[PDB]
Amino acid sequence: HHMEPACKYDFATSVLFTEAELHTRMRGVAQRIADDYSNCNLKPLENPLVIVSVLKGSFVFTADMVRILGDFGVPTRVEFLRLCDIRGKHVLVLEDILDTALTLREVVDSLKKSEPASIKTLVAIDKPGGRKIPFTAEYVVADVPNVFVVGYGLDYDQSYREVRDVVILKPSVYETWGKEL
Amino acid sequence: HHMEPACKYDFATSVLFTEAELHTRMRGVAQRIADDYSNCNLKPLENPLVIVSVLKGSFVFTADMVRILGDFGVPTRVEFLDIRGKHVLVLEDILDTALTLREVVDSLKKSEPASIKTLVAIDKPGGRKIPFTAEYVVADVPNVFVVGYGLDYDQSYREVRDVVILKPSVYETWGKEL
Numbered sequence: 200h201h202m203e204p205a206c207k208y209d210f211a212t213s214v215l216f217t218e219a220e221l222h223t224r225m226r227g228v229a230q231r232i233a234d235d236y237s238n239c240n241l242k243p244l245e246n247p248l249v250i251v252s253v254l255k256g257s258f259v260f261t262a263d264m265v266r267i268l269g270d271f272g273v274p275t276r277v278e279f280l281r282l283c284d285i286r287g288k289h290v291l292v293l294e295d296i297l298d299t300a301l302t303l304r305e306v307v308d309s310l311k312k313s314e315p316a317s318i319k320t321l322v323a324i325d326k327p328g329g330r331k332i333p334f335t336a337e338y339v340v341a342d343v344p345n346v347f348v349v350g351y352g353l354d355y356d357q358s359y360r361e362v363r364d365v366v367i368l369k370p371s372v373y374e375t376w377g378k379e380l
Numbered sequence: 381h382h383m384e385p386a387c388k389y390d391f392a393t394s395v396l397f398t399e400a401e402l403h404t405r406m407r408g409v410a411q412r413i414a415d416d417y418s419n420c421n422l423k424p425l426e427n428p429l430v431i432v433s434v435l436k437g438s439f440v441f442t443a444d445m446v447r448i449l450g451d452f453g454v455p456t457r458v459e460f461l462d463i464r465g466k467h468v469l470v471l472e473d474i475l476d477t478a479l480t481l482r483e484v485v486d487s488l489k490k491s492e493p494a495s496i497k498t499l500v501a502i503d504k505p506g507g508r509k510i511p512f513t514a515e516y517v518v519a520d521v522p523n524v525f526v527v528g529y530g531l532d533y534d535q536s537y538r539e540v541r542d543v544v545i546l547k548p549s550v551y552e553t554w555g556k557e558l
């Protein structure tokens with residue numbers, strides 16, 4: 200007899216990624232970023248990696264990632280969208296989730312008009328099945344099936360971003376909030 | 381005789397508050413906020429505590445504090461820089477002259493919130509150009525330029541996990557780089 204314990208949060212049916220396994224994946228991604236940008240000569244002030252964070256849900260991912268990137272010797276400067284002369288500089292766009300990729304595609308092609316030295320993308324949650332156009336992020340922290348999630352910046356009607364984990368809400372959450380007139 | 385160990389950062393003379401030291405104070409502030417908003421019936425979706433974060437340096441302090449508030453049963457929704465009838469908590473990374481924070485508070489009281497308070501990570505009392513007091517303060521700092529935990533020196537060093545004081549050679553070297 201399989202014993203399935205109840206979800207840790209009384210508002211969710213399942214926890215997909217905890218804060219701990221998110222950070223460890225990010226410490227792995229940071230090492231790759233530190234290796235790839237090794238030949239770019241990144242220094243604070245003189246030549247930092249321009250982190251372009253896509254508001255709003257990316258603020259949690261951006262806060263943890265730049266501190267983790269700093270542990271691996273990757274100096275950064277942050278910019279928020281939805282800016283700054285990125286001409287000649289290295290740009291790394293950060294999104295909390297990558298679903299249809301229509302937003303990330305428009306932002307990347309926009310920043311390339313200013314001609315940066317290079318430009319890649321790092322997403323915390325990749326939702327590959329929900330894509331409308333072909334798009335691959337250079338760096339992906341974790342992958343999720345085609346199910347709506349919240350937490351770690353991701354929201355449901357601007358709420359539950361504070362959930363430290365990426366979880367799946369109960370259906371009763373949507374109807375209890377739908378019944379509110 | 382007295383010996384002073386080297387700072388753990390090659391770019392800083394001093395480390396004022398560490399990441400763990402800030403988090404401990406933030407959990408202490410979170411317990412007070414949960415007590416002050418105890419009878420407000422805060423709840424996700426229906427009536428969350430509207431967090432107004434003052435870009436840019438506050439994004440680190442906003443990401444950490446918002447999660448800590450969740451641990452203490454304080455549901456929040458984030459805004460970055462309507463609240464009519466909602467409780468508002470303005471978050472700012474550092475409170476120095478208070479000119480920016482006073483204008484934001486007075487701009488938000490136009491929409492008539494249920495209540496509005498302020499929470500700053502770093503309070504710099506001796507820097508005020510006008511009298512102003514934040515309801516919640518994580519830590520205090522003397523009148524000295526600091527960086528880290530979102531605070532920047534020319535858009536850099538925000539990623540430093542602790543609130544440190546840069547060496548004068550950092551200002552001098554970057555200053556002679558024109």
Ligand SMILES: Nc1nc2c(ncn2[C@@H]2O[C@H](COP(=O)(O)O)[C@@H](O)[C@H]2O)c(=O)[nH]1
Binds near residue numbers: 296348
């Ligand atoms: N919280 C959350 N947001 C998502 C998820 N998948 C896509 N999104 C975001 O939700 C928005 C899509 O709008 P919608 O399809 O709800 O009208 C986009 O901003 C997209 O990035 C998810 O699984 N969880």
Ligand SMILES: Nc1nc2c(ncn2[C@@H]2O[C@H](COP(=O)(O)O)[C@@H](O)[C@H]2O)c(=O)[nH]1
Binds near residue numbers: 526528
């Ligand atoms: N990094 C850092 N920023 C500060 C400090 N004190 C004030 N600031 C910020 O610096 C700006 C004012 O600097 P100023 O315009 O005088 O160069 C304001 O945004 C203010 O909040 C500090 O000690 N460290």
Ligand SMILES: [Mg+2]
């Ligand atoms: Mg959205």
Ligand SMILES: [Mg+2]
Binds near residue numbers: 353354355356
């Ligand atoms: Mg959303």
Ligand SMILES: [Mg+2]
Binds near residue numbers: 437531532533534
């Ligand atoms: Mg500054």
Ligand SMILES: [Mg+2]
């Ligand atoms: Mg400033």
